[PDB]
Design a protein around this nucleic acid. Structure first.
Lengths: 83, 116, 66, 177
RNA sequence: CCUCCUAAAGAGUAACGGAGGAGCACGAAGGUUGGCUAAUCCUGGUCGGACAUCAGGAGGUUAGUGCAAUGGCAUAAGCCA
RNA sequence: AGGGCUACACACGUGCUACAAUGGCGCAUACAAAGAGAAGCGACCUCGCGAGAGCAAGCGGACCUCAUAAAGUGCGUCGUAGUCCGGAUUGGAGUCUGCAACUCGACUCCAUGAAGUCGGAAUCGCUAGUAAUCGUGGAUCAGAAUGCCACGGUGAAUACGU
RNA sequence: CGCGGGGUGGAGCAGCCGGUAGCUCGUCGGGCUCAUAACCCGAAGGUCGUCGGUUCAAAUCCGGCCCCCGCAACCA
């Protein structure tokens, strides 16, 4: 993980978007590519459609998801089974 | 020779003996011993009752045996609930830390299952 | 009770390290040195702390913040 | 009979206070404590059953009855009249003593004890529980035993309701949850 | 040779009529004294599961009878000593 | 810009580490060679359990730095156990590089302690300072080697013969 | 309809007493092999047609049914 002294990582644009959403009080999904962005307390409640390489997959943020990153909840590979 | 919630081997040395507790390895055992004021080399046999009590008390400071197990369970369960990558991996039975399964995930995947 | 068949059942003293001495009849024979007594068992103290769900958000706040 | 004594003076009184019984006979009382060991592995070899019986005896100062198959089931391979389990029925002073032991020592010794069940009362007062390890009782020696054993305790009581039974148990500071 | 039905409410009653059994077993599975009461289901209970053993109940012989079927059997003819 | 080349029922190739006592662990202590270094090597001192951090000389270098060689030797301990063997795996917490370590870096600490008790058919290397074993360095390179290319240490067995 | 054989691992031939549950070729796996056929080692494939019962051993002894055989007899 990232160093504690450096703080958490979130993409600036993403953060801005989140802030805007908060200000509004809207619940329309924000399509995002920043899979590397950490989830924040203020992001709780928002749906945020994270890119998985191919498509944006909706992620309703929860109290448990905070320390994690957005890419953790948007699996890229699509394996069903060998038979 | 009953510490935390288990029995402990009497013939073995203290440091080693303690390691029989789920949640204490070698370093932790050593620490416990230090706290007690008991030598590492002595056995669990030929110990005083007071000493044993002290040891028990020391052990009680850490999260061990049942509590530890519970804690361990909780995290995994939480992960599963989340459905984060790690959680998904756990539910699959596939390596979580980012190992290149290819032809070597036999600890998670278990023994080989021929195609049928 | 029938005379021969049964085990020897006799009064012994049982001592929890907590300090509670407990006279009881039993098949042990020798004196009993207990490790936990019902008086000195952590049901009521432990089980609040033993779950340890905590707060994720709180944790996040603690480790780093603005 | 310390527990019995306690019951006679205090527990009964408490019960009276709480449920508002007219007669003292109307209060719940514990009739018997039964201790069963099923031991299906006895069919493979005789000695295991014997061992189990011995263990039971050690636990509770009676010598156990050795139960036998009523009606003979399909999958587990037992003919009728196969010595298949053992039991001990405890009553009176001995029973009381056992009860005292169970709460004041054995239950405390349970590995990862986080209480007993309150819903395990069956609907007519009679409580039943299971011990996974027979080592929890300090009668058994840890070094001596070869096979891991368990058993079930069944407290039978005169409580008409389950609730009443539960209350009675509580009045003996029975763990629960 | 035994049981049921055909057999017409005493007995008996035929067919290459309809259905099943016997050619033994047991020194206890006999005698007697004393005691006991079933199947099945439900709920609870360590391993233990549709199905072992143990508790609480419903049930009332639906079970049992050394083996076919009938008639019997709780005063048990059923189960223990 | 993000992802992939790092996927994973499986099969093969080449390596590393093991399965232990000719050893593991602990404390003390001896003897190399050959290299690299300026957007670089970085002493000493201070702090950190440690990876490292801070300060900051000496040095384009037979001068200073990397840089303590390790096996060995002595003393202690463990006593044939899946172990004080073995380290995979996973959890926590972190260090450094780098705009950036989720996919996907290395290293550290604490915990965790799989398989494995010398390996079927078969199959490879080596004739001497060789094999075997022990460390050390370099290139590429911000970071990222068990690979490659180099260096010394200890140091065998056997060759009747075709 | 009656009477003699009996009914299985992809096919086939399985040791009088019910406790043994196979062998050949086949498919995979790997090195032999100048090549495969190989020799050799190991591995996946069941119900014992079926419904029942005597018995803890049952497919393995018997009562019926479905088929494969074989029978020899019949046919206004």
């Amino acid at each position: 993980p990232r160093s504690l002294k450096k703080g958490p990582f979130i993409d600036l644009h993403l953060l801005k978007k989140v802030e805007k959403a908060v200000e509004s009080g809207d619940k329309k999904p924000l399509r995002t590519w920043s899979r590397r962005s950490t989830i924040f307390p203020n992001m709780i409640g928002l749906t945020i459609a994270v890119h998985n390489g191919r498509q944006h997959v909706p992620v309703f943020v929860t109290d448990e998801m905070v320390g994690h990153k957005l890419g953790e909840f948007a699996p890229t590979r699509t394996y069903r089974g060998h038979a | 020779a009953r510490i935390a919630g288990i029995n402990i081997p009497d013939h073995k040395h203290a440091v080693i003996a303690l390691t029989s507790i789920y949640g204490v390895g070698k370093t932790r055992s050593k620490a416990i011993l230090a706290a007690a004021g008991i030598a590492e080399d002595v056995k669990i046999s030929e110990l005083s009752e007071g000493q044993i009590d002290t040891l028990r008390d020391e052990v009680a400071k850490f999260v061990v045996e049942g509590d530890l197990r519970r804690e361990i369970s909780m995290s995994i369960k939480r992960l599963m609930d989340l459905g984060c990558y790690r959680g998904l991996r756990h539910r699959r039975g596939l390596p979580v830390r980012g190992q290149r399964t290819k032809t070597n995930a036999r600890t998670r995947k278990g023994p080989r299952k021929p195609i049928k | 009770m029938k005379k021969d068949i049964h085990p020897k059942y006799e009064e012994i003293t049982a001592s929890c390290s907590c300090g509670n001495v407990m006279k009881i009849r039993s098949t042990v024979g020798h004196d009993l040195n207990l490790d936990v007594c019902s008086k000195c068992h952590p049901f009521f103290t432990g089980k609040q702390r033993d779950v340890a769900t905590g707060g994720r958000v709180d944790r996040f706040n603690k480790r780093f913040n603005i | 009979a310390k527990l019995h004594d306690y019951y006679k003076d205090e527990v009964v009184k408490k019960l009276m206070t709480e449920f508002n019984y007219n007669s003292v006979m109307q209060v719940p009382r514990v009739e018997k404590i039964t201790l069963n060991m099923g031991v299906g592995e006895a069919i493979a070899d005789k000695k295991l059953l014997d061992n189990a019986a011995a263990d039971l005896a050690a636990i509770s100062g009676q010598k156990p009855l050795i139960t036998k198959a009523r009606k003979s089931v399909a999958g587990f391979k037992i003919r009728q009249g196969y010595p298949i389990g053992c039991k001990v029925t405890l009553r009176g002073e001995r029973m009381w003593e056992f009860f005292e032991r169970l709460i004041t020592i054995a239950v405390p010794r349970i590995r990862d004890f986080r209480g007993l069940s309150a819903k395990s009362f069956d609907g007519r007062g009679n409580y039943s529980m299971g011990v996974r390890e027979q080592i929890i009782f300090p009668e058994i020696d840890y070094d001596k035993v070869d096979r891991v054993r368990g058993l079930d305790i069944t407290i039978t009581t005169t409580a008409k309701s389950d609730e009443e039974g539960r209350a009675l148990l509580a009045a003996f500071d029975f763990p629960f949850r």
